[PDB]
C-alpha cells in the first residue's frame, strides 16, 4: 500500500510519500510512474522483508 506523507503544490521535489512494502526476497527494484502527473526523482530502491 502507498501512503502520502507531505506534498507541496510546487515545482521542486516537495512531495514525499511512504510505501508499505510487502516483499519476499531482497534485491533492487526500479520505480517509475507511467502517468505524467507526478515525477519521481528516486530511481532505485532495495527491498527488505516487509
Amino acid at each position: 500500500e502507498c501512503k502520502i506523507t507531505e506534498c507541496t503544490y510546487a515545482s521542486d521535489f516537495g512531495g514525499i510519500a511512504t510505501v508499505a512494502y510487502k516483499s519476499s526476497k531482497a534485491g533492487n527494484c526500479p520505480i517509475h510512474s507511467p502517468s505524467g502527473v507526478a515525477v519521481i526523482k528516486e530511481n532505485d530502491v532495495t527491498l527488505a522483508e516487509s
Binding site: 506523507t5 507531505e6 514525499i16 511512504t18
Partner: protein, 50 residues
C-alpha cells in the same frame, strides 16, 4: 500615587517614565525564522496510530 491607581497592574519608576508590564491588548507579532533550522519532512519519524 499613580503607582497604585493605574489599572492593568502597571508599574512606574525613576526613569524616562516608562509604564512597565501594563498587561493590556494584543500584539501582532510576525516572525521570519531562519531556513537553516528546518529539517526535511521525510527524515523525521512517522508517529501515526497513536
Amino acid at each position: 500615587p499613580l503607582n497604585d491607581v493605574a489599572p492593568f497592574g502597571c508599574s512606574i519608576a525613576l526613569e524616562p517614565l516608562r509604564a512597565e508590564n501594563c498587561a493590556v491588548g494584543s500584539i501582532p507579532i510576525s516572525i521570519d525564522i531562519p531556513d537553516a533550522a528546518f529539517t526535511r519532512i521525510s527524515e523525521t519519524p512517522t508517529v501515526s496510530d497513536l
